[PDB]
Amino acid sequence: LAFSPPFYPSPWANGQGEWAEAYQRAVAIVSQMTLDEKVNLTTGTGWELEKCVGQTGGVPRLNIGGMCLQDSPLGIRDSDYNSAFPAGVNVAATWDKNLAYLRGQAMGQEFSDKGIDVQLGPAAGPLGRSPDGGRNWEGFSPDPALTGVLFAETIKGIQDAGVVATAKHYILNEQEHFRQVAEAAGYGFNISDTISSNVDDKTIHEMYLWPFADAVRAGVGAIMCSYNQINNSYGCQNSYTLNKLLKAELGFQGFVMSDWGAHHSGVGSALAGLDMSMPGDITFDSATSFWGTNLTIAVLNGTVPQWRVDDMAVRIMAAYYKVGRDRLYQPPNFSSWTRDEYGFKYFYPQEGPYEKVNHFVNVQRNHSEVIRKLGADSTVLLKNNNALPLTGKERKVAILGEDAGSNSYGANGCSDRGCDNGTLAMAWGSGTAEFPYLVTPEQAIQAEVLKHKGSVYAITDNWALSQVETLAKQASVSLVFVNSDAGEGYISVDGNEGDRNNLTLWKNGDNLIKAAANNCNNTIVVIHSVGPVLVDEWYDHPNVTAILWAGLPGQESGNSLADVLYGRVNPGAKSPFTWGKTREAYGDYLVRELNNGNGAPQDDFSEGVFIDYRGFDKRNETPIYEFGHGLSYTTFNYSGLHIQVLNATETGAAPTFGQVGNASDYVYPEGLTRISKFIYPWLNSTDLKASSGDPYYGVDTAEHVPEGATDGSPQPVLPAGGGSGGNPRLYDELIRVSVTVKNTGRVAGDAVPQLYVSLGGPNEPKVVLRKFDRLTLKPSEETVWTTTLTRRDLSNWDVAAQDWVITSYPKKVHVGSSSRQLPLHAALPKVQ
Amino acid sequence: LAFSPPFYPSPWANGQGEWAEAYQRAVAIVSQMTLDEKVNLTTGTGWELEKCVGQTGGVPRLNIGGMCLQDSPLGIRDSDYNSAFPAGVNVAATWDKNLAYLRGQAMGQEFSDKGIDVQLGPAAGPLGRSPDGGRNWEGFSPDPALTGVLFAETIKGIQDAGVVATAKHYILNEQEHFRQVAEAAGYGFNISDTISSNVDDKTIHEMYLWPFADAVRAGVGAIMCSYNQINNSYGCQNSYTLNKLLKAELGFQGFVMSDWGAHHSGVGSALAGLDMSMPGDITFDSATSFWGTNLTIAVLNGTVPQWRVDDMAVRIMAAYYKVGRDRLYQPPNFSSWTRDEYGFKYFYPQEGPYEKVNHFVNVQRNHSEVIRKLGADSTVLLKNNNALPLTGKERKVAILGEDAGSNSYGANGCSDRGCDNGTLAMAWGSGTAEFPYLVTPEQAIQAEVLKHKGSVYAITDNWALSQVETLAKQASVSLVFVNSDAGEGYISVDGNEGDRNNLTLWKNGDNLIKAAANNCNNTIVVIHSVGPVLVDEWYDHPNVTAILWAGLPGQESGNSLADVLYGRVNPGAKSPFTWGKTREAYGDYLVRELNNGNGAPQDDFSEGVFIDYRGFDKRNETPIYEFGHGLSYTTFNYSGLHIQVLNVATETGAAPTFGQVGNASDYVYPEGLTRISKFIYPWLNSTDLKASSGDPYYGVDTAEHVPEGATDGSPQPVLPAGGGSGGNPRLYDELIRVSVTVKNTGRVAGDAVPQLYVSLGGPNEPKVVLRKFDRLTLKPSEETVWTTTLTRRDLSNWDVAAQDWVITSYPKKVHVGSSSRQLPLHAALPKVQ
Ligand SMILES: *[C@@H]1O[C@H](CO)[C@@H](O[C@@H]2O[C@H](CO)[C@@H](O[C@@H]3O[C@H](CO[C@H]4O[C@H](CO[C@H]5O[C@H](CO)[C@@H](O)[C@H](O)[C@@H]5O[C@H]5O[C@H](CO)[C@@H](O)[C@H](O)[C@@H]5O)[C@@H](O)[C@H](O[C@H]5O[C@H](CO)[C@@H](O)[C@H](O)[C@@H]5O[C@H]5O[C@H](CO)[C@@H](O)[C@H](O)[C@@H]5O)[C@@H]4O)[C@@H](O)[C@H](O[C@H]4O[C@H](CO)[C@@H](O)[C@H](O)[C@@H]4O[C@H]4O[C@H](CO)[C@@H](O)[C@H](O)[C@@H]4O)[C@@H]3O)[C@H](O)[C@H]2NC(C)=O)[C@H](O)[C@H]1NC(C)=O
Ligand SMILES: *[C@@H]1O[C@H](CO)[C@@H](O[C@@H]2O[C@H](CO)[C@@H](O[C@@H]3O[C@H](CO[C@H]4O[C@H](CO)[C@@H](O)[C@H](O)[C@@H]4O)[C@@H](O)[C@H](O[C@H]4O[C@H](CO)[C@@H](O)[C@H](O)[C@@H]4O[C@H]4O[C@H](CO)[C@@H](O)[C@H](O)[C@@H]4O[C@H]4O[C@H](CO)[C@@H](O)[C@H](O)[C@@H]4O)[C@@H]3O)[C@H](O)[C@H]2NC(C)=O)[C@H](O)[C@H]1NC(C)=O
Ligand SMILES: *[C@@H]1O[C@H](CO)[C@@H](O[C@@H]2O[C@H](CO)[C@@H](O[C@@H]3O[C@H](CO[C@H]4O[C@H](CO[C@H]5O[C@H](CO)[C@@H](O)[C@H](O)[C@@H]5O[C@H]5O[C@H](CO)[C@@H](O)[C@H](O)[C@@H]5O)[C@@H](O)[C@H](O)[C@@H]4O)[C@@H](O)[C@H](O[C@H]4O[C@H](CO)[C@@H](O)[C@H](O)[C@@H]4O)[C@@H]3O)[C@H](O)[C@H]2NC(C)=O)[C@H](O)[C@H]1NC(C)=O
Ligand SMILES: *[C@@H]1O[C@H](CO)[C@@H](O[C@@H]2O[C@H](CO)[C@@H](O[C@@H]3O[C@H](CO[C@H]4O[C@H](CO)[C@@H](O)[C@H](O)[C@@H]4O)[C@@H](O)[C@H](O[C@H]4O[C@H](CO)[C@@H](O)[C@H](O)[C@@H]4O)[C@@H]3O)[C@H](O)[C@H]2NC(C)=O)[C@H](O)[C@H]1NC(C)=O
Ligand SMILES: *[C@@H]1O[C@H](CO)[C@@H](O)[C@H](O)[C@H]1NC(C)=O
Ligand SMILES: *[C@@H]1O[C@H](CO)[C@@H](O)[C@H](O)[C@H]1NC(C)=O
Ligand SMILES: OC[C@H]1CNC[C@@H](O)[C@@H]1O
Ligand code: NA
Ligand code: NA
């Protein structure tokens, strides 16, 4: 079986780069803390014991309120009077750094105004190994350069608005199936440990880790480690991914929290680089924790060095100070577990004062504007045979498909969005927010038609084909809506356990489109979906005159779409993944059956880097719509490529901050009423063994602590580390590339120039994206797009050097409008 | 068994009153026609043979195009790019003569622009004997005064727009069960003839006949006789209702058409006062007709007098001229049977030239505006505990109920509206039109809330009660939508064979309302229905803060309602029927089982005049909401009632004939004409009359089957109650002027609906009966004096001994106020005669 080698000690923070001020403030306050106070920062207080999806107890003697951590990557979960933004995959479809940022900012503002300290998002893991993976839509794209840039801009927007962002899930959680042992049991499978993603060192560096290096360099304050194992070592105690890759090589200065139920040991995880346990207990409301009491004991008994807990507390306070949360602090003014105005303060056991638990604060501001805009700018026009934009003069409009209409249970009528009923504007699981309302395509397109005194109807039963056919024969234009949904693995909809069982349109979508197109010579298909779907049965039908993919647009869905269909917005989005002829064309199959008996299922990433377009190009397969493809209401020309060549070895010793006293300093204080299931830092008595309750307490302890796990002496800086996101020399700019871009059509709009490189060598993809931008040009207007290639951009990861190297194979650059339409190309000059 | 006494001969037209010019022009043209041409005017061409629901062949030699007759009373049926107006019941709820006229005008304009000559509406029969009758909603109100006045204004709007209106159904078609034998057989019932409505002479004059007297006096061109029998004689050959009540007593000058399949004999119907057979065949596509060829033969063989057939022709041409149809004529520019651009000219057999059958003419103009306004102005506010109007500042709005949302088959996705899915804006059967679009309450209310930056959702599955209760707990206001549907008897939805099986909300509505009100202290109920529904289980719930009934609003439903809920329109509508505690409180049970073996079921109207509020008041029962009840966002005061007393041929001419009849050979099929399969023609196969009729009863006991008087063309007496239009003109003398001051005593402009009831006196008269009303717009503090007059008819009762209206010697009283039960002003009336 795959093996995960050790890397110890867990590196300590050092005030790196833009962290210097936040780290000095964190060390000044952590220095004042007792051991039980430090431990309070590191451990949640128990599932649904307070207000937020995750919440720590804070340090009240030092005026630090408990840290409130809340989903989701696309808006506040489990709350009220908040907005529901389009999903991360829509941000990927915009290819628009500025919109990713502005969406970050608007979410940060709403979370901050609910008294939330830490947003659990954005996501870049899953990256998207498999097109049917259940959570790819929360992240961005299976391409690392596109994902890493939009991930980083999202982070910066959220943190500039004063909320800590949490880059998740770290790392290789590329499928829902078998990701948790209790979930698998509920779905009929008996496994002893979760699925192990088994991945070679070059692949992890070139693909899955690269957006985390961007998040790190962009200043992300938190990282959430993942439920799966990596080479048979759990993500939240994997010393290789956490100590070596994240903290030593990428130089991460913030804190690593567990995913909920992903914490699997106290001592093991603390020494392997975990800093925060969520929701704080061992299983939900077990009243036991691998940390809390147990971590205070682990330090008192000498097994976890003081410097390790001290560094947890410094990383946690430093992220909180880095975003300025201290200046915006207020306790969470809502409850994730009830919408009632009043309730017992501690929800799960219904204890504590009976008091106001919701204040109904309306944090929406004018955020519907950025959502409606980001929806229109993420609507990919895949096909347009001169059918769009509409004019408003069409005499009779047929709106067809359940995906155009209302969810009959209300927009929030399925818990965590766990159904696919009515228009699909948000997929399911934790990656969700309550809509404040939901504008359906039916509502916005019928309003638009009635404004022009046209005739219009909506048929929203996809087996009502008699009516579809009759109305399609009478219509000037048939707008046909179809979807495909997916989500987090703890929910199953129609037997899809988070992951999609296939890429075919749900709810009779293919037959609905063929019924319309058999009868209307102007059939326009609109797809809402978590990722690609199969279109081969109808996309080339002669009466299908346009096709659009609008992703998961959030609350302004129908208005975002109408703006595009009626020409208020000229679509600029590009596909952020590949649209293949068959599921086989993508390869990268999910592990859907036990393959290691009743042990952990083994998920070998045997394709290496060759996911999505890199795999189609390697196999010489032709996509229907390639990565980077999207049309516009105008045309663009690219010409005039020009290329120009441009002109610490050790750490400190681990520090300790403050003093640790005797056990009797950490016994429960006598005036305090202990709330049932609440997780505390304190001991029942000075008897360490008895207060831990651990059946393994004090047995074979040293043989269970890896060599070096307690070494606080100065360490070597890795060749590829020493900076933020990697050695700073990786970010030196080596080549500048320019091209001229002209709008040669009649409509103002945006181009998305894309710069790919070919790094050369027998095992490298033919082309890999490295730069892009989204440039607004009026008709006939031109501009020069200039960008630069860094040392990292031209490197490959060398497993023998443990470093990025520019290999000696000759490299080329290609610029154009998609991964398959690259009219400009040149050999690059040799650089090192 | 009830018996229907004979009345012969069938009165001939005479140019009465406003018909003088139309009659002269009809005589002049019918004088030029051959017998087969005349017959062509009287008989439709066969079910689906041409474009319109009914269609005659016309007279091409004299450039008279075939007459195109199309449904419905609320908009053009079976067509395209037309509007869908609110139902006649909503017009009744407006209590607004002007809006009634404006709706008729906007409908006549649309019909005229499609090349339709005759609109099959409006309807005042069923009047509304039973609250569960399947078609009451197409008419107006169970009250004859409210109905007759709004029926009349609807007819004047249509005919002023140049289309002939058809007052239907004449008469006593008060229920759908057993109305047609083949329908009854499709539902498992074996009957040899249709339901017989059996009614006494005073009741028919005081109730069912009264709105038709108004129709006739307002100048209606056509009348459509009914499927039921009346005292065991079919509506379309009932000499008593057609010859005596309609043509002699009411003096009707236009033409009587059959309902479709209501024509039951050639000779018998022509002599009993029928003028036009629709759709022209005996059963759909039978290629046989009681008229056409048979009527030509019946005149040739001496059995139907030429004067009778000339009179049919003159009544038909006179109605056509009277509305100026000849000045707007164009062939129908759509087909009722297909939406294809091209097709065979003769749809049913797919014969004739292949040519353009649809021109897709957009006739809607800006009629959405009158629809929008009339839906708002017909929304009755039944209860409002200071909950409405909404301000727009409600922080979270729950829209609850399938009736708020879309029909998932599309607004037109159920044929003839034969389902109750999504918002109910139109009930089912022939009384329907294709929506151009349908704005749902969900759409218009969610749009209003988003304009104010509120939060809003719609739950539209009425068994999703977990979600309903969760959202209702979170909401500032919960708007709960519920409905109850019905329609014409040939369609059954959920076992309701046209008629409603109960007056309970459909689709779990009572449980939905209780789920919302148990959780939300500001639950507002909105009812779309064909008539009253039982509200006893929740109307008085402490968290039910407002209740509205919005009827069947047509295509602008959601916008009409939002205009009211948000106070752009202050509701002025008033209930046009009673809301009782139980079904038993209304009495008047439908006949739902065979009670005459396998012969015609018998429907005895044994309550006499005591239907709807007259029955409740007679039984001393308290309605939840009485007839005439509606609240406003302002208040009104009525004061200062004052009463002021104010200051005909005896024989007809002889029956004329116009033009000449020749030999049987003039009427044989023309040699060079292709005869279209199933098409009905006026021509004979040969000069053999017997063989050309194909009638198994031809020449059988003929004399015995021709009623006494039926061929009598000599001068007739004028009935004491006849001699004018809608009755002897002395009935319309104004005898009393009544005035009262109405003041808006509140803070917002609005419409008051003053109502004037009389008590006629006498042991068997209703305690009060509506006579006058108007709808008056007043600004805050403004006053106005409402003045109206009572006519001799208004103060009379029908005396069966005299056969005339008589002001009886019991002391009479006037009562004025805001409903049938809120009448603060009363005055004794002085003796007048
Ligand atoms: C010139 O050319 C013309 C065009 O071709 C020729 O016209 C044909 O003339 C024939 C006579 O020669 C006609 O045939 C006879 O028709 C009658 C009338 O039938 C209709 O009306 C019935 C009710 O009638 C009353 O009311 C009408 C007006 O509404 C009056 O006109 C009648 O006079 C009669 O009036 C009395 O009652 C009213 C009150 O109700 C009073 O106010 C009056 O004061 C009078 O008292 C109605 O019931 C009939 O309905 C039947 O038919 C419908 C289908 O059309 C169907 O939907 C109904 O369910 C019902 O079906 C049942 O009956 C029919 C037959 O009629 C069966 O086939 C069927 O299967 C069912 O049983 C209809 O709407 C009709 O009554 C005559 O039939 C009676 O007499 C014959 C024998 O003479 C019997 O064989 C029949 O069974 C029947 O017997 C019943 O009645 C008897 C009373 O008379 C009684 O003794 C018996 O006990 C029995 O119960 C004839 O069928 C033919 O209609 C007409 N064709 C056209 C196309 O117009 C003309 O002949 C020719 N001239 C010359 C000189 O050659
Ligand atoms: C790890 O994080 C966890 C989670 O955040 C931290 O746990 C929290 O620690 C808090 C202390 O920082 C502790 O706070 C206590 O709350 C109690 C309940 O308060 C609520 O109910 C009261 C009473 O109705 C309301 O007044 C109040 O507003 C709340 O609604 C308080 O009662 C405690 O107040 C006492 O201590 C504080 C100072 O901490 C005094 O300011 C206050 O006056 C009270 O002082 C009395 O009691 C203390 C000790 O209990 C005495 O030392 C003092 O002399 C006073 O004694 C008199 O009164 C008591 C009875 O009232 C009487 O017996 C005595 O004889 C005298 O007459 C305090 O505010 C949270 O409950 C606790 N959270 C949970 C879930 O357990 C933990 O500290 C963190 N750990 C570290 C190491 O940082
Ligand atoms: C007066 O005249 C009116 C008009 O004719 C008469 O009304 C009819 O009354 C009938 C008798 O009540 C009604 O028939 C009943 O219909 C009930 C509801 O059927 C619908 O809803 C259910 C439940 O839907 C939920 O669950 C679905 C499947 O899980 C889900 O898809 C759906 O979205 C709903 O979800 C919510 O709830 C679930 C859990 O419950 C949650 O998980 C979810 O999150 C949501 O919260 C659905 O199954 C069904 O297919 C349909 O769409 C039925 O439930 C009744 O059937 C039960 O009881 C029967 C005994 O009565 C028994 O045979 C049967 O086996 C069931 O146990 C029943 O069919 C009818 O609809 C009314 N028609 C109209 C037009 O209103 C009225 O009866 C007359 N009144 C009187 C006094 O005479
Ligand atoms: C009772 O009402 C019915 C239905 O309205 C009338 O029946 C129609 O009568 C009209 C007028 O006579 C008939 O019209 C004839 O149609 C023929 C076919 O016309 C179409 O197809 C041709 C061939 O492709 C086209 O070229 C043409 O434009 C039409 O689109 C015409 O060809 C006839 O006109 C000429 O033909 C005859 C040949 O016999 C010659 O005498 C002349 O040269 C003449 O120019 C004619 O127009 C129509 O077909 C009838 N309809 C049906 C359904 O049968 C009755 O006439 C009316 N009865 C009374 C007594 O008024
Ligand atoms: C600590 O004491 C508490 C309360 O007495 C007891 O419930 C708990 O089990 C003890 N913990 C351990 C590890 O024994
Ligand atoms: C008249 O002639 C047609 C065509 O020959 C024949 O089919 C039809 O049956 C006849 N009508 C009658 C009453 O015989
Ligand atoms: O559709 C034509 C006729 C059918 N029977 C009912 C009438 O109201 C209608 O106009
Ligand atoms: Na086809
Ligand atoms: Na309650």
From Swiss-Prot, chain B:
Q: Where is the active site?
A: D259
Q: Provide this UniProt record's keywords sorted from A to Z.
A: Carbohydrate metabolism, Cellulose degradation, Glycoprotein, Glycosidase, Hydrolase, Polysaccharide degradation, Signal
Biological process according to GO: cellulose catabolic process
Pathway given for this chain reads:
Glycan metabolism; cellulose degradation
Under catalytic activity, the entry for this protein gives:
Hydrolysis of terminal, non-reducing beta-D-glucosyl residues with release of beta-D-glucose
By sequence similarity, the record places it as follows:
Belongs to the glycosyl hydrolase 3 family.
Which Pfam families does the protein's record reference? Answer: Fn3-like, Glyco_hydro_3, Glyco_hydro_3_C
Q: Which residues are glycosylated?
A: 40, 190, 231, 294, 301, 333, 366, 421, 502, 521, 543, 637, 647, 663, 685
Molecular function via GO: beta-glucosidase activity
Which cystines does this chain contain? none
The record's EC number reads 3.2.1.21
| Protein's name according to its UniProt entry | Beta-glucosidase 1
